[PDB]
Design a binder for this molecule. Structure first.
Ligand code: FAD
Ligand code: MHF
Length: 469
């Protein structure tokens, strides 16, 4: 009996469904496989910082698997089509009787998995819904359709959660054969860049410690602090969650352990709501695959006449729009691979609704930079800002970057952190530095608004209006 565990976006020993399931049979030979697909990653616009996070978790996992007496067979092919052949070869070469793997919901990943299952004729394959707390299809509407509005989805989700809460499975124990010697460190052949390991922990114990600490302190204050970018009021666990360094059940159980009432509206319930948004978006692409194929959820939005303007898109990408809160947000992204949620909303809105540039442009750019890049969450957030998605912002909802900035970064603390050239404009005017610049006969080394919000807004409303006709 030989059990093969095919890792992907789940590089952890703890609470890993396919892994725990392969090791139940203590008399079975257990092998782990990991296939690097540098070319499919490039196509999917994988961020260099995330590629680096994965590489780091991959070496740390190899080391942890060795102590459990489980060996990792590393392979590097080009794409998902090639991987099918590699899984076939590894099964054949090692006489694998059973394959255990955790499901991936994106169109390309699913197609690969379906091919692997068809190809493995004499093998028993068991996939697991490890990336979600509740599996797609667990929370369905009365006519067995997926929910289209979050509010009722959430209600039904909490209901089913209560009828049987999934539990955290433990890290497997050492194999009968004993510990083994780790193979030499792997190096992913994909452009990679560094990141703050303090904010985004690469080690499993560090990820867990960060979840612990947040749930103890942060989850209670969350509702009151989550809106301020200048404040560290969010978990910064999105990178671990996106790559599989942590599972959503670890977050759930650790949350309820510190905030008991989180399930019933008490403290910690607002943070839980966000984990339910994550759930929503993952089930949604599972039932609506076209969301993985650049299609909007609201068909008529495809009729909006987006602006083809290279100068405007470039200014947004480089953070030279002339709107401090938008610019500071882009420098944050470009330099750390992460952006505060409030700012992901503001910058995405600025691109689609002030510049009227196709949301797919902003999405791709975000993916290319985001250490937490994830199709369901990114596509979902972009379709929300653009009013093209499921339960998205209403088309007439056009965030005003100055108002947004005055609210959430009233003092310009965050702003002055990322825009050193504005570290002399006094407090309030910092949100509209050029208006003050003239009235002081001063030259700022900062751009001027590339668009006037009032007129931009009018033009956009007209465009949507015309498409919605
Ligand atoms: C245009 C846009 C693009 C986005 N791109 C991504 C992306 O690629 N990857 C990603 O993980 N999130 C994305 N989101 C949500 C995003 O803001 C992040 O979740 C991030 O801010 C989390 O930082 P945190 O870990 O400190 O979050 P916390 O606030 O501490 O939230 C905890 C966990 O819940 C999940 N979460 C939080 N907000 C959302 C959400 N609205 N939808 C789904 N899950 C959520 C994340 O897995 C997160 O780690 C996007 C939002 C917008 C508006
Ligand atoms: N991580 C990840 N996984 C993905 O699967 C995925 C991404 N990211 N990023 C975007 C790409 C592109 N995706 C796509 C885009 C188009 C088709 C597509 O046009 N396929 C049609 C073709 C039919 C025809 O040839 O007429 C289909 O119906 O299968 C499929 C997947 C999904 N993709």
């Amino acid at each position: 009996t030989t059990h093969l565990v095919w890792f992907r976006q789940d590089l952890r020993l703890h609470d890993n469904l396919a892994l725990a399931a392969a090791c139940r049979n203590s008399s079975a030979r257990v092998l782990a496989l990991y296939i690097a697909t540098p070319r499919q990653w490039a196509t999917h616009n994988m961020s260099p910082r995330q590629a680096e996070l994965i590489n780091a978790q991959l070496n740390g996992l190899q080391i942890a698997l060795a102590e459990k007496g489980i060996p990792l067979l590393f392979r590097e092919v080009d794409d998902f089509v090639a991987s099918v052949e590699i899984v076939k070869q590894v099964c054949a070469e090692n006489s694998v009787t059973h394959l255990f793997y955790n499901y991936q919901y994106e169109v390309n990943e699913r197609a690969r998995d379906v091919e692997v299952e068809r190809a493995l004729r004499n093998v028993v394959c068991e996939g697991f819904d490890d990336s979600v707390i509740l599996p797609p299809g667990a929370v369905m509407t009365g006519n067995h359709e997926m929910y289209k509005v979050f509010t009722p989805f959430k209600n039904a989700w909490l209901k089913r959660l209560r009828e049987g809460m999934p539990e955290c499975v433990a890290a497997p124990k050492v194999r009968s054969s004993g510990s083994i010697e780790p193979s030499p460190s792997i190096t992913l052949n994909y452009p990679r860049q560094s990141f703050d390991t303090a904010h985004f922990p690469v080690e499993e114990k560090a990820a867990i410690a960060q979840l612990r600490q947040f749930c103890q302190n942060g989850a209670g204050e969350y509702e009151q602090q989550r809106d301020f970018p200048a404040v560290e009021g969010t978990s910064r666990l999105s990178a671990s969650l996106a790559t599989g360094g942590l599972s959503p059940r670890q977050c759930l159980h650790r949350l309820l352990a510190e905030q008991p009432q989180a399930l019933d509206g008490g403290a910690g319930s607002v943070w839980l709501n966000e984990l339910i948004w994550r759930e929503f978006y993952r089930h949604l692409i599972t039932y609506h695959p076209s969301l993985c194929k650049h299609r909007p959820f609201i068909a008529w939005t495809d009729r909006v006449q987006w602006q083809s303007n290279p100068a405007h898109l470039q200014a947004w990408q480089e953070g030279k729009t002339g709107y401090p809160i938008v610019d500071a947000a882009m420098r944050q992204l470009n330099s750390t691979g992460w952006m505060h949620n409030r700012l992901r909303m503001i910058t995405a809105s600025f691109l689609v609704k002030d510049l009227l540039i196709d949301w797919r442009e902003g999405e791709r750019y975000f993916m290319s930079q985001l250490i937490d890049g994830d199709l369901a969450a990114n596509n979902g957030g972009w379709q929300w800002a653009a009013s093209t998605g499921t339960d998205a912002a209403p088309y007439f909802r056009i965030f005003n970057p100055t108002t947004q900035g005055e609210k959430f970064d009233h003092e310009g603390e965050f702003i002055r952190q990322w825009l050193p050239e504005l570290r002399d404009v006094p407090g309030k005017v910092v949100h509209e530095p050029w208006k003050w610049a003239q009235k002081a006969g001063v030259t700022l080394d900062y751009p001027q608004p590339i668009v006037e919000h009032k007129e931009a807004r009018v033009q956009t409303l007209a465009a949507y209006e015309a498409a919605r006709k």
